[PDB]
Amino acid sequence: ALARLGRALADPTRCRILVALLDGVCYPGQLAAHLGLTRSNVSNHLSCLRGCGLVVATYEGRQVRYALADSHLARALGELVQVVLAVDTDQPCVAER
């Protein structure tokens, strides 16, 4: 849903998760190598992401994995949102302000 999709995709670590899952889908905490952040730290944000649907927790040839929800997010994130790659930044809100 719109008010889940946008809050989970426009987030510091979760944008970084979702794009590193594209080149990942290994094991629980594998994103720690992709991000440099602890396997504790990165898994915290997945406890939102699996509820927002955006990641699907699966099994592979020997262990459990976290994949993007479908080809859907793997494609639309893989074009890149084009906004220079959204990062956290000190820019304000409201027009003319």
Gap between the Cα atoms of 18 and 93, Å rounded: 26
Between residues 50 and 61, which has the closer beta carbon with respect to its own copies? 50
Is 26 labelled as part of a ligand binding site?
no
Question: Which residue of 48, 67, 74, 86 would you call a contact of Cd ion, by CB under 5 A?
Answer: 48
Between residues 51 and 78, which has the closer beta carbon with respect to Cd ion? 51
Which residues of this chain interact with its own copies, rule CB under 8 A? 1-7, 9-12, 15, 46-53, 71-73, 75-76, 79-84, 86-97
Gap between the Cα atoms of 12 and 94, Å rounded: 22
Q: Quick check: helix, strand or coil at residue 86?
A: coil
Residues 6+ apart with CB under 8 A from 88: 12
CA-wise closest residue to 88 among 9, 26, 10: 10
Binding mask 49-68 for Cd ion (x = CB under 5 A): --xx----------------
Is 93 labelled as part of a ligand binding site?
yes
